[PDB]
Amino acid sequence: LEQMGIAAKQASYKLAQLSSREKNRVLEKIADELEAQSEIILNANAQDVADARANGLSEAMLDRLALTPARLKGIADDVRQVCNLADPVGQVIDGGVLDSGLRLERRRVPLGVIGVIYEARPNVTVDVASLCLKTGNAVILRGGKETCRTNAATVAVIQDALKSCGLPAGAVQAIDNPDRALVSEMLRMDKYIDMLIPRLHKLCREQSTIPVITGGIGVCHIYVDESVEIAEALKVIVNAKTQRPSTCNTVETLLVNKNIADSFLPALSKQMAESGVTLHADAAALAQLQAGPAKVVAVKAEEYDDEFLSLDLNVKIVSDLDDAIAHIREHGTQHSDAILTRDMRNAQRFVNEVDSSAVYVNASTRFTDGGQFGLGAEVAVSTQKLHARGPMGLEALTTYKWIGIGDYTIRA
Amino acid sequence: LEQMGIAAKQASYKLAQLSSREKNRVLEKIADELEAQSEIILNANAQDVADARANGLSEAMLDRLALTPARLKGIADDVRQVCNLADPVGQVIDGGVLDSGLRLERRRVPLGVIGVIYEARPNVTVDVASLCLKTGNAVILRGGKETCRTNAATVAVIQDALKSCGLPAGAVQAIDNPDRALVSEMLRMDKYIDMLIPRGGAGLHKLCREQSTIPVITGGIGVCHIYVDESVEIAEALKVIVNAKTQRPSTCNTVETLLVNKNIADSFLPALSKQMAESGVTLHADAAALAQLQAGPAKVVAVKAEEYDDEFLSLDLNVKIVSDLDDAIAHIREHGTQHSDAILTRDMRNAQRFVNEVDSSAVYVNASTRFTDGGQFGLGAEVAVSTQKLHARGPMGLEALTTYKWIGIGDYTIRA
Ligand SMILES: NC(=O)c1ccc[n+]([C@@H]2O[C@H](COP(=O)([O-])OP(=O)(O)OC[C@H]3O[C@@H](n4cnc5c(N)ncnc54)[C@H](OP(=O)(O)O)[C@@H]3O)[C@@H](O)[C@H]2O)c1
Structure with missing residues (x-):
């Protein structure tokens, strides 16, 4: 999985220098292509639903993992909605002139590579893909075993869109293999992955070395x-x-x-x-x-x-x-x-x-929702006290760096 | 260490419920006591420097360990300048009115209990204690091997000031024993400390990150x-x-x-x-x-x-x-x-x-x-320089030791 991680790193490096207009055009293009190839997605979804029903899953679970053409139309709709959000990358937080003639400022920058883990949720795939594309973060998806075929088809379609728009193909990646050892490996790439979203919590709590923004149960x-x-x-x-x-x-x-x-x-x-x-x-x-x-x-x-x-x-x-x-x-x-x-x-x-x-x-x-709080869209709700708390919007996926400009200034 | 942690939590609740005037009073008394007791600190630091040089310490290492009256005045001035800073507790980050009529806002709050593991340096203890008291957090410090007597004197002065001001005695605690098993146990105790700040080289960072169950803001080495x-x-x-x-x-x-x-x-x-x-x-x-x-x-x-x-x-x-x-x-x-x-x-x-x-x-x-220092960057003082990407980055000031909380007010508003 080292090659996938290095590809994600290179994709993040390329994406961090993109412009807002290019990202918006890319989002609209992927929405268009998702709408165009609806039948291919629906066929795989129907096959997966039949397999799950054969496995004996309940009606509620079958409905949850199913996808209607109306559902994919709605997916196109919220992708187009995120296309219209305000890009927070490059925005200046604060700054000023220091006593020693040095001008300091703080600038928002992409967080790098984000690895998210979910299970039996088809829409969250496209949602997180779009949300990370808007911010300029390469994303690694952990598709559930139940809906591996649908997730593979969706990520293939998104990668095709990215190739059509000329962006590197490694921006969005997914691990279709359901092996738990691969899950542990993903839980143990500290040098490559910079942030992890587990949407199960005990496993990452024990094993993870990457900083983890937990979702957690809520009473x-x-x-x-x-x-x-x-x-x-x-x-x-x-x-x-x-x-x-x-x-x-x-x-x-x-x-x-x-x-x-x-x-x-x-x-x-x-x-x-x-x-x-x-x-x-x-x-x-x-x-x-x-x-x-x-x-x-x-x-x-x-x-x-x-x-x-x-x-x-x-x-x-x-x-x-x-x-x-x-x-x-x-x-x-x-x-x-x-x-x-x-x-x-x-x-x-x-x-x-x-x-x-x-x-x-x-x-x-x-x-307590991303849409209600006016953040547009959310990836999860964080119950920890570090980094973001509560619903996590666009600004929750960006860090900041200090920039100082001077004229050959030396500390005294 | 369990009693240490429970005392830290009990003191942290009251500290988070305190006000700015009391914290400023505590900081001013701490600075005055530090100026008054300069002789004991200077003697302890001189003895420690002599002992370390007797073990063939590096000249740069000795300079880091060395503390002069000018440096003591400088740390007192830094404490005073921190006291003069605005309290970042309770400040509003942003807010608004939603469609449904829910007045929403975001407010700053203390992190809770903070553990710190720093290198052999005398001033970092004072700065960490001052920042944690100003921010309303409770602090557990584990010092280096060299800075034993100076750290003991400093923590004694700080605890005496806290007792005089009437604040709970568990707000600031330190571990005297230099055993690394105690460090491992502090690392493994999660449900008590809310954030751990390690300062040191690659070995310490690797050791904690291998056996950490607490969020860690790594100081990291600097190239x-x-x-x-x-x-x-x-x-x-x-x-x-x-x-x-x-x-x-x-x-x-x-x-x-x-x-x-x-x-x-x-x-x-x-x-x-x-x-x-x-x-x-x-x-x-x-x-x-x-x-x-x-x-x-x-x-x-x-x-x-x-x-x-x-x-x-x-x-x-x-x-x-x-x-x-x-x-x-x-x-x-x-x-x-x-x-x-x-x-x-x-x-x-x-x-x-x-x-x-x-x-x-x-x-x-x-x-x-x-x-790249807390004082130069406009912040009053720094607890550590964070090289990671999560939460704070660069020098860590008062705002780096706080989290935020959403607050919503409505008239029996119902989501539609
Ligand atoms: N990032 C920052 O903000 C920052 C600030 C100041 C300094 N530094 C770094 O400080 C480094 C030098 O520090 P130093 O001269 O004190 O040497 P060091 O070896 O980096 O110091 C390690 C610190 O942790 C302790 N420690 C060492 N090994 C440990 C282990 N296995 N388990 C638990 N605790 C352990 C040490 O005390 P014991 O040896 O007694 O255990 C000491 O307090 C430099 O590389 C510099 O980059 C970073």
Whole structure:
């Protein structure tokens, strides 16, 4: 795989000097060619879907790994959308004249070669390819074993487009082979790859030597204060849970203040049965919600630290804001945390004392997305504290360097 | 070390919840105490320098270890200047209003617990402690073998100041034992320290990166190349080179390879040989420049292959003749450590191309490579020079020790 890495390095060197207009024309060209050769992609997708169905995968997984012609049309659409974004490469961050007559400035530059790992997601292939092409970063894709044929066809089409536009063919590469030893090798190219996006986390945590920007699992907690409007809080909770539960930013643990719980829990159950989410409630929550129409069961200790990714929820009663903060600190994964309240001091304390990647006040937790934050598109959501945090846009894939201009200046 | 880490975390929470006035008070008291207790620090440093010289320490190494009253006043002034800096905690990076009506913004926050493993140097401890206190982080320091008594005195003074100010005693901690097993255990303890800063040579960096479970901002070694173009002033280039090399050769931002164009090599090489002979710099010249530098007064010797990829840390320089700007760029890319690179030229196009095509942490045009320092770059003080690409790069100031957090405010806003 050394040859592939050296090809990616050369491609990054060539791409770092490109112009914004050339990148936009390239993006439009690849979108056009993807639209043109839709039938070839669809045939491979149908074959892969038939193979997966023969393997016994569920209907939901089969739909997820499938691709309709409408889906590829949408892929062309968001590629064209990223074509219209603002290029952050070369932009000046800050600068000034020093005391010794030296003019300093900081300039944004491409991060180099980016290796991303995913599984059973066909659209993310084209999405990450376009996003790295816009920034001028050579990308190495880890296509899933399930959809190897579709990913191979897509990367072949993109490479054909790049050759048509004259760009080096090594800008975008993919490893179709599903061998785990190759995965370890990719996890152990420090000198070549400069940054890794794992979209599984434990494996790279143990083995990786390249700096890793993790995505991580997300258990988002919502705290309900004693003074709040019942109907609006219920609507916010329903939007946070009912709409697309499979997303990693959905709420999982709901914290209800002790004082308001007596009134909140009955209406919560009344709306909850209509929404139809199972309530893994605590002991006191069980006692209060037993009369409720919504189905409710006891909660186990390990359920608080794991995301259901389904129509399930956890109900816990806390004494006050300090108890909720302690619980969030102990069990939270630092992904998203929101508070519904009508007190200014409580909101200020919650904002100051919580160290999540995104804190909301009287808002849903479903806004932790690249599109909602106005970043155009995102590659992943980072829960670490280094480099980018939260949704990662274009500027998250660029580093900076210092440039100093003088006239034979010497330090004194 | 588990109790050390838990104390660090407990102190870090309160430090992140503190205000700017208290941190400024702590820093001012630290500076005043350091000025008051100069005699003990000076005596300890003198004893340590004498002991190290008794073990045949290098002159540059001794100079790095040596601390004068002027240097103590300088570190006190640096502490005060850091105290005068604006607090980067709570500052807003950007914000706006979304379509859905969600007022969004980004705010700076402390990183948490910071571990640092530095070389044998007395001032780096004070600067690291001051920066971590100003930023609201808790710091665990592991010093070198030589700086034992000076580091003990400095950490005692800092802890006394923290106790006097009423801040939690776990904010700043240091490990006295020079055993490397403790270093390995610090490396393996992840859930407690949030970021590790190693300062040293290749061996330490390799050791941590082999057994690291924490994010690491490598200090890295410095091989700084200076490229001389065809059209350039000989005297000014010689002065810049002399300033880059002669002044403090023990640093990590000192030029180690001199790239000379063929066209200018006819005239630049002789005069250079005269200049370095004044400074006693030994010239490790390539085969092409060996004939030209043979008649020069300065001592000249052939250069081995591995010399291009290692730091001399002495009064030595590598002289190589390159064909053009592209050859120099290729050589810098192949053998450079991405620390600092400078070009001396009188052509605009060459300077622009060199700035564009060189992906180093610092690029200079008609300037020395000795400017790659936290103080010179306008920052109050530096914790380390980062040669990596993730998070901070180049000198690391106050903003390099902070992360950010998104905050959104709305009136029960719902995503559609
Ligand atoms: N990048 C920067 O910002 C920066 C700044 C200053 C200096 N430097 C670099 O500093 C280097 C010279 O430093 P130095 O003279 O102190 O020598 P060094 O060998 O680079 O120092 C290594 C440091 O780590 C410790 N160490 C060494 N081997 C270790 C091991 N196997 N496991 C754990 N710890 C280990 C050393 O103390 P023990 O030997 O007692 O373990 C010392 O504190 C230069 O190459 C220069 O580039 C870089």
